[PDB]
């Protein structure tokens, strides 16, 4: 399956890059949530 | 044909890599904002507990 091997390799490279996007997206969501929690406390602190 | 499928997978990979570089930029920017807020909150928390005394 020489044609199959080429398909699997291209699929491998395709998914690896997609998983990297998925990883970075999750990390960005997490950081954005941490920013939200800190800014929430920041607003209650400043309003004193 | 499979060649169209192959070219599709290649195009998907290149778009994802371009998307990766953009995400690394945003993540790096967010990390600084989080660090600034965390540093600012520690000052506010101290200043607030400083006023509670007296």
XYZ file of C-alpha atoms in Angstrom:
102
model
C 0.000 0.000 0.000
C 2.418 2.661 -1.217
C -0.513 4.978 -1.934
C -1.828 4.235 1.552
C 1.480 5.135 3.210
C 1.517 8.533 1.495
C -2.048 9.163 2.657
C -1.237 8.197 6.247
C 1.891 10.369 6.338
C 0.015 13.403 5.018
C -2.778 12.701 7.500
C -0.158 12.431 10.249
C 1.366 15.828 9.453
C -2.131 17.291 9.086
C -3.312 16.058 12.483
C -0.078 16.894 14.320
C -0.389 20.546 13.312
C -4.101 20.532 14.148
C -3.399 19.062 17.588
C -0.844 21.818 18.139
C -3.506 24.409 17.322
C -5.886 22.604 19.674
C -3.232 22.621 22.404
C -2.461 26.324 22.014
C -6.163 27.203 21.841
C -6.795 25.434 25.148
C -3.821 27.172 26.763
C -5.113 30.503 25.465
C -8.591 29.834 26.861
C -7.030 28.970 30.215
C -4.923 32.137 30.269
C -7.926 34.250 29.274
C -9.857 32.709 32.160
C -7.036 33.444 34.606
C -6.990 37.027 33.341
C -10.737 37.239 33.958
C -10.415 35.977 37.537
C -7.555 38.365 38.314
C -9.275 41.363 36.730
C -12.419 40.553 38.713
C -10.468 40.702 41.973
C -8.634 43.742 40.610
C -11.899 45.643 40.166
C -13.203 44.798 43.642
C -9.854 45.798 45.142
C -9.652 49.130 43.316
C -13.245 49.984 44.235
C -12.384 50.664 47.881
C -8.885 11.454 -7.241
C -6.547 10.855 -4.298
C -4.223 13.598 -5.548
C -6.896 16.206 -4.814
C -7.268 14.656 -1.365
C -3.499 14.783 -0.847
C -3.292 18.445 -1.863
C -6.191 19.143 0.497
C -4.349 17.597 3.450
C -1.240 19.597 2.552
C -3.201 22.854 2.438
C -4.797 22.031 5.797
C -1.369 21.501 7.374
C 0.010 24.811 6.083
C -3.025 26.733 7.335
C -2.662 25.107 10.750
C 1.020 26.047 10.984
C 0.132 29.647 10.145
C -2.543 29.428 12.830
C 0.025 28.115 15.321
C 2.276 31.164 14.949
C -0.670 33.492 15.573
C -1.704 31.556 18.682
C 1.816 31.673 20.118
C 1.703 35.457 19.746
C -1.630 35.777 21.553
C -0.614 33.340 24.298
C 2.598 35.276 24.923
C 0.637 38.523 25.178
C -1.888 37.011 27.588
C 0.879 35.675 29.838
C 2.157 39.218 30.391
C -1.292 40.645 31.150
C -1.861 37.874 33.689
C 1.507 38.613 35.297
C 0.710 42.331 35.501
C -2.707 41.778 37.089
C -1.268 39.264 39.555
C 1.413 41.762 40.565
C -1.118 44.593 40.801
C -3.522 42.506 42.893
C -0.818 41.767 45.465
C -0.269 45.505 45.891
C -3.994 46.202 46.219
C -4.500 43.310 48.642
C -1.673 44.686 50.775
C -2.873 48.290 50.592
C -6.393 47.187 51.516
C -5.240 45.103 54.488
C -3.005 48.047 55.387
C -6.060 50.273 55.796
C -7.864 47.629 57.856
C -5.138 48.129 60.430
C -6.462 51.325 62.021
